């Protein structure tokens, strides 16, 4: 691909972090505690997945960033509308205001309503999330394998701000502590 070019500086959003994630200084890394961070609890917390968003809000044009991936057994990327529900169960879907692909139990799927097969030959330690407003289109690109396209979200109703999403997964494994973390420019 050649969207490197609508690079965009991410950072994470500690007041809609869950309440056991451990973001860094430079807001650019996230991974999930042991145990409660000693936060208070706010309305855009999510609160039964380790889920957090982006600071930055996209109404209009082209945006692509990078997540590191290495050695996480299950983690979603991808985008979401600003006013997605935060608090209690749902499903990843863009009926639900989400744009995600995600890694679990060894398999790749988009997360469409039901959910996709994805068809990846070389295991992505990074991955590249392109956002076309105005296009209606979220690609997702493994940046291991040469840039190979993973995924197209075509026909997008965005219906509303997009904010990139995140989710590190639970570590009920102990395989999984590794952190995502936003890659330089
Ligand atoms: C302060 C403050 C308020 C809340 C709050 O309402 N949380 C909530 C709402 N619905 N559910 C299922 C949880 N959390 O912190």
Redesign the pocket.
Known sequence: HHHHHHMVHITLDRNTANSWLIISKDRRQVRMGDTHQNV????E?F?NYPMVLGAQRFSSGKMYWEVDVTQKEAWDLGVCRDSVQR??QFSLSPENGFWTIWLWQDSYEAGTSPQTTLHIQVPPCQIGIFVDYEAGVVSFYNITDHGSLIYTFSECVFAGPLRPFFNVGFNYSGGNAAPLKLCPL
């Open positions: 208070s609890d706010n309305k917390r609160s608090k209690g």
